[PDB]
A paper describes a structure:
The X-ray crystal structures of the representative Mpro mutants S144A, S144L, M165Y, E166Q, H172Y, and Q192T with and/or without GC-376/nirmatrelvir provide a structural explanation for the drug resistance.
H164N is a high-frequency mutation with 4682 occurrences and remained sensitive to all three inhibitors (<4.1-fold change in Ki). The catalytic activity of the H164N mutant (4.2-fold lower in kcat/Km) is comparable to that of the WT. GC-376 and nirmatrelvir place the same pyrrolidone group in the S1 pocket.
Numbering used by the authors:
A (entry chain A), B (entry chain A): 1 to 304
């Protein structure tokens, strides 16, 4: 029993982290086959960062201007190209620790593990959701850029995130491994707005299922509701509208617990309308939306 | 910016996990040099578990009765010994992936990362505190025993925990790597009581410091207090009494933020006496006690 914000084991990603230095700027790179991926803003001086012309800045750089270091080992750069907001440095050496991997553009509401790195060395690992407004609630200091978010599927590492910047609200923004930002953000040191941040309804429901499975049942009420009725209440509280697809995804959890999704919806509506009255669910005094239905079933069936 | 429940990178511990099978029972083992460590209750049948005589049960077992598997690789067992509640299986092969390591008996209030495993394969990683009552609030299913808790100090893995059992309250109990239980627990399937579970005051203070550092300052009040006065209020709310040692440990955080420990104590007293009035601190609606002062300074200075 017990339910915990659980990260993927980080060993296969640790083996891909390198240090990328261009002039004074140092951040983390991802070393897969003979290509090192990092944020293109490694080429910026603190001045460039206010409104950089990446095209013009990159032209003053050649392969020898990119210092790539794995442990104490200095890699030889034999090619450089800019793809959106990612720099790809061709190196003479294929990473002998390259896991089986894919690049995936993850959907809002899905989760992933962040391996927070500095100077190409791992610091720690934590689970994040891609929020509806394409930000994450991370822990990132200077030097953390190039740190990556990933899922593991048995042997296959799926990289989905590369850390780039912190917004004025203190939340975090980054790119997929093709260098395309999640959300409307650009890699320049200007004030940038994430949209209103809405709660991931299907994830809140999964976590209430997770709680029921763990013997927290107090919030279970005598009521039911419909999607429209519930969605009226969802809109009021900035919850994402629930859909039959969301119901279908919860099916396994519904069928395991024997609690109809719309009954759980009625429970959530009363939680949302009355608060928790100083009570807690799975050791939290707020409704948690950073667990997917998959996250719940993995942790509850002991997937490795 | 940002503050997250962060686990250590798990790569060095992943390389030490093996599968130990005795008869039908399978759990995880830790493979360091030519010794595999696992819970001695691997030798129990479901019947034995109610009141096992480990001495008599172990005597019916020889080296060939211990099936040790690393990946698809079957290790040869050339020796077995019981040390408290741990079985040490001597194997013919030294683990070529053995990290630099120590066995440490960790203090209550200190934190560690758990690499949750099944069949010797990693499932995920999360941070736990050893509670004052020598239990942890984990996520552990059947097969999870042998899963270990550890800290990393640069190159050195410090193993402190090996998972053994879940108590009726749904919290978790285990041994150090010498097989000595944390707390009054024994490895038998009987009802066992952890003591009253008290809050780790020094950790709550570190986290309020963590919050101030992250721009959450609302709870900062105009009051101060003394240790005795504060400790009167601590006893009332089942907080561990605060000591000059605890103050000295917070010194760095106090000196960084410019907020006296006793002023922060006065803030905590009002939080404890008035609750949070529906407000949140670092995205929590409860006072968090599973961050040590070290945890806060590591995450805030980007230690790797
Ligand atoms: C990459 O290492 C860095 C990560 C920032 C630093 C502090 N917390 C983060 O997430 N990214 C940047 O510095 C980024 C570079 C621009 C070219 C996009 N700029 C940025 O994030 O500005 C906001 C900020 C900078 C420094 C401290 C706090 C916030
Ligand atoms: C080790 O794999 C297992 C871990 C339990 C299983 C479910 N959650 C856990 O932490 N440990 C035991 O099964 C342990 C063996 C005794 C000889 C100590 N017994 C135990 O934990 O009893 C409580 C329990 C058993 C099964 C399910 C739920 C609770």
């Amino acid at each position: 029993s017990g339910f915990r914000k659980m990260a993927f084991p980080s060993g296969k990603v640790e083996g891909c982290m390198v240090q990328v230095t261009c002039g004074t700027t140092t951040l983390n790179g991802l070393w897969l086959d003979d290509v090192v991926y990092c944020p293109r803003h490694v080429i910026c001086t603190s001045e460039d960062m206010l409104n950089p012309n990446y095209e013009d800045l990159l032209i003053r750089k050649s392969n020898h201007n990119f210092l790539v270091q794995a442990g104490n080992v200095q890699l030889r750069v034999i090619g450089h190209s800019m793809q959106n907001c990612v720099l790809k440095l061709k190196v003479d050496t294929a990473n002998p620790k390259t896991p089986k991997y894919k690049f995936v553009r993850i959907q809002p509401g899905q989760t992933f593990s962040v391996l927070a790195c500095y100077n190409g060395s791992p610091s720690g690992v934590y689970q994040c959701a891609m929020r509806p407004n394409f930000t994450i609630k991370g822990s990132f200091l200077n030097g953390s850029c190039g740190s990556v978010g990933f899922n593991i599927d048995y042997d296959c590492v799926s990289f989905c995130y590369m850390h780039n910047m912190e917004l004025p609200t203190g939340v975090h923004a980054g790119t997929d491994l093709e260098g395309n930002f999640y959300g409307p953000f650009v890699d320049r040191q200007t004030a940038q707005a994430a949209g209103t941040d809405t709660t991931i309804t299907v994830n809140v429901l999964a976590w209430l299922y997770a709680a029921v499975i763990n013997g927290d049942r107090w919030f279970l009420n005598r009521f039911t509701t419909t999607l429209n009725d519930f969605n009226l209440v969802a809109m009021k509280y900035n919850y994402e509208p629930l859909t039959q697809d969301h119901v279908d995804i919860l099916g396994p959890l519904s069928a395991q617990t024997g609690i109809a999704v719309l009954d759980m919806c009625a429970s959530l509506k009363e939680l949302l309308q009355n608060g928790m009255n100083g009570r807690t669910i799975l050791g939290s005094a707020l409704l948690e939306d950073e667990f997917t239905p998959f996250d719940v079933v993995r942790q509850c069936s002991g997937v490795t």
